[model samples]
Target chain A: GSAVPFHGAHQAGIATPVQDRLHFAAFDVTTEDRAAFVALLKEWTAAARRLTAGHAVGEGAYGGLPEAPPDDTGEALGLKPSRLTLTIGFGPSLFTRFGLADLRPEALADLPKFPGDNLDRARSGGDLCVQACADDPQVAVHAIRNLARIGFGKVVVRWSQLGFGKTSSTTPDKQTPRNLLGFKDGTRNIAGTEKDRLDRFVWAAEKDGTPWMTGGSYLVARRIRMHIETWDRASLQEQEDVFGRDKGEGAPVGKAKERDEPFLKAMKPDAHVRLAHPDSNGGATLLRRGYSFTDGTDGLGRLDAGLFFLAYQRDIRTGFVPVQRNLATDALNEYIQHVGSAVFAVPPGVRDADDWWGSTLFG
Target chain B: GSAVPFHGAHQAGIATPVQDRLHFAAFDVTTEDRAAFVALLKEWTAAARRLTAGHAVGEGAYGGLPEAPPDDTGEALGLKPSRLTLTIGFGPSLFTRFGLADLRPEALADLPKFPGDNLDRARSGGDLCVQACADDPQVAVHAIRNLARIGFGKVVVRWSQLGFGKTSSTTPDKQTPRNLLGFKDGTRNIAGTEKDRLDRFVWAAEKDGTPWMTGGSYLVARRIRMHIETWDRASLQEQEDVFGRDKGEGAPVGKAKERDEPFLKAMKPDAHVRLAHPDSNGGATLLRRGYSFTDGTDGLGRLDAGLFFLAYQRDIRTGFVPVQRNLATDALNEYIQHVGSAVFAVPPGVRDADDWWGSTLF
Candidate 1:
């Protein structure tokens, strides 16, 4: 399909087929006027609907008034929507000053630092965030840029990430994507077709959080910097030992197929999958929507590349936190570090043309 | 079409279907042993052929020695070849130190400085360069990484660029690609199928220069930083004035369609097309194979993005140098700056399995 359906019960991106490209931006709201911020969300909703449907924004990149800036940045001109989806999220800090404290979801709590985290504050938190996923990188970028253009005085882009390769698989029939480490990373990821699993492990409910987030989910974004140069030097045996899977077929220890159930005890005690597996994490699972990134070099002759781990879940306590803590001693930790993190209360999808982002609270 | 017949008279990338992604790397040869460096070129040629054919290197990324590193980097394991192409070029600096000054082509002279150039030394100049183009960005990066891996201790990657969008079109049937400025760039670009135009303007000839570069072309790479934030704020009329083309139809000054021949003198004297047009530069034409890049933020709350201008030609005197000089007074200069630049004398392609890169010199 050229465009993913924009209106749904829940947001589109979390369950949508992962796009080949990602333009994830976290914005710092500059407007103190509550109405102005709300106004922009309404405007953003209209723009998102048009962009996702392969139509241009208000007045488009051209055909606009001469004096004012074009309603849309023209870079995406003559381009298709490329199955674009713009997902909005409200972060923990958004509640502190917006008179939205009462609307903050319990699942929207800030992520607690795990062992060996080297967080960069600039990339960590934001009052508002948007995830633009599309088959075309420029389309994704154009979406964010236009939204940012209209949001000039209202919001400033705190940080942005461009991911080329999707590192997760929501379609069971498709091949599992490998991370920068050359190992299949999300073999057992939650599938979009699994409504039961999504309801239990991915979506939020009134009982789990605030009413505003009833049909919503929590988004945890992590920048996992892979020590590829060092990992590249390791022997194939050592690399396989760390992931507890065959480098080629991604088979578990004592197994011959990638999908075969892992015999956890047979694998090394410190293996990554052994520790993070759902069975080992006490049934905890995450709907991963991660992407791999290559941000040039480290200036020391090494690639500044890794996985931008994006996971959506029902609740934080049972989703990422416990599972991450369980892998504190995983051997793979030596070759990876969490350098940036953010958690946002992903609102439910836009229900109708009249509906808007963050409407549950502001409407 | 999947694997653009790797065995070609000239490099495949120059005239092949433009790939969606690019991974360009410039290396500094550290090995003093000329034989060792030449040996790696043979290895790279074998690997390039396999990679372009969607085959794994050596015994594959896995299923080989568990004690040694994997032959391939395995990230591109499940991926297709994506029509990958690898083109090699030797920079002018390579000749000065590599005991091959006699073989250096005159067409590969180091580009002279142009007006309003702000070059970054770190991103400029190299001894050897490789251009990897693929439909998939990862596949492109994978090819470069594997080549660099095998070249460890012998060569160090001086600078690398990853381009996500192809800014030039070789196929005339396809829509011309737009640059970051949102204008239809390369509208009048030389087509790959234009053999007559190519022979006259692009390919190196034995009579013109060294025998080693007979079939190859000289490549000029420039990192043009577009001042998008400032440009984005300009009025539509002003923007059109700079490009001398309508935003929607991309039509030239008084032309109704994008393909209409431009009435050169009718356009504003300082307009970009008016100044850079071949007719304005003494009939100079370049086989442009440029790409658009967005390297995150410029740390000043703006995108550090622009065009990675790549153009090939038979001679430097009549190619990029003179055309760029003609653009000294171009109205578009206010919105762009040349940041990084390099000139390379591309060697002719490998003839077959036995032929290797740079075999003409070494």
Candidate 2:
């Protein structure tokens, strides 16, 4: 299929092969009535399904009513689907006004601020979130832009971030992508083919105290700013010591190949790989899909660039929170900062064409 | 060859097919030492040759001296060249500080203030500029990032812009790209394959009085912001009236196909296409290589997005100025504004392996 399936047992974007581009947006749910919010979700699904199939929303972009605004923004009119996937998530704040607090899943754990977090309130949390991934950057942008257009009255875009170069890959056969730091990232990430590992560590289950979120996953979005100028001037050996891999082959300290098994003892005690390893974090793992971003100059003679880190797991408490806390004193901490953070409860996918995005919860 | 040729009679980016992504940087030359400035140019040319060939900036990214910073940043180490082309341009301001003021061509005309311009000084002018175009955005980013690193002390980035989608394509056989306005742009633009027209309009000649700038072209960069929200709410008929074309096929008001001849009388008096056509602009044309850009939000709940307009011509005085003046009352003006502008004299390309950028001018 030219497009990624919009309906599935679980959402596609999480375990789906990571696309080359990403445009993730956070929204402020402005409506107080529960009905309006549900309608927004349903309308979003109706459009998202059409968008993923490369079809124009409503009748047509230009042939629609002469008096009313066209149902679809025409930017993506002639472009291919490029495998666009729109994954919806609910933040904790959505429950406050919608009278749906009872439906909020416990698995949507709040992110405890880490040791050196420099969180920006404007970029941190939201009432709802949508992750748009596609091979063509414009396709991803059009998806988010149209969603904003559709949700104009109900949900205003709180903040949005985009990434051009992928920093992580879900398919192992593909070449590993590098972050702005020039080191290969996500070498041992959970592969999409590893179903057992995905079930055990990634997807939530009904028995886990969240039936609505069963077959779903929790998303933790962190905007990690890498001090590239400071990192760029460091010596090659110093750089390798921070990541616990050689700068060339991306192999472990004593290993010769990139995919070689890491010998933890061979790495420096506080190296990033040594501390962030699942073996070191109580067998904890995350299906990490991240992208590299450069947003012009920082106004201080530096490029405002970094990795937009996205991770999905069964529960953040057992997943990102603990693993992040463990990196409090990691050596790589000196060169990177977590400037923005958010966690969302991504419910199970739309089961079929008639089934809407959040029907399982609001029904 | 997988890479765009670095050495040629003319620069590659101007007439070569447009790349998928662009990272353009404008620099303010900080050093007063003449020799040091010349040395920086040589070093830049040396690094660019290897970069275009898909090689590291120096001997190796990580295999270099451990004590000294790696000669080349390793971010682009494993990536392909992706047909990367780096086109360098000297700004009009570059003549003020450099002793080579006499070398400045008269064709390097300073752009006059146009109507409805809301220019930002910080993003406008530069002493020097570089245009990096590549199929992969990362390659373009890597090229500029490395240039900034190599130019640490001699120069600093005044401003840099990134474009994810191309708004214009020289290869007209391919489908024309749409702008944020969702209308097909560059429909009647000058195509690269038209050699006679390119020679007449794009490349400068020594007979114009400056041998140093021979085979080169002048560039005008304009950051045009589109009021998409307002335009989106406009009726379909109103949208088509602005561009003087139908929304579906991008054909002129009375034509059926996108490439059909535009009948100016069929369009409105202030229609954009009617006003900016060669017939109305005294036969002026531009080799446009513009790109579409989005830099997140505008802090007012709207996306900060627009077209980073790049137009190259044999002479800006006759080419862009007159055409832009004709656009004074364009219907499209209500929906767009030029916020940033820069004009540069892009010299000829490197002739051989040993040749350096700006050698003739120096």
True contacts kept of each: 0.54, 0.56
DockQ for each model: 0.54, 0.56
Best by DockQ: 2
| Clash count per candidate | 0, 0
Q: Lowest lDDT 10-mer window, candidate 1 chain B?
A: B295-304
For candidate 2, write residues A162-212 as lDDT tens digits: 896642222223778777778888789999999999999999988999777
Give candidate 2's TM-score: 0.98
lDDT of each: 0.85, 0.87
Question: What is the per-residue lDDT of model 1 for residues B1-362, given as tens digits with 9 covering 90 to 100?
Answer: 26677887798899887888888999988988888988999999999989999888877899888899988889988777788899999888888775886777766777777889899999999998999998887888788888888888998888888888989988877988887778887788888889998899998888995887888898999999988888888988889888788888899978899999888877888998889888888899888899998876666555567899999998987898899888889999999999999988888878988899988778
Regions more than 4 Å wrong, model 2: A166-173
- Hey, what RMSD does candidate 1 come out at? 1.9
lDDT of 1 by residue, A92-170 (tens): 8889776877777666667677889999987788888899999888888888878887788888888889896642222
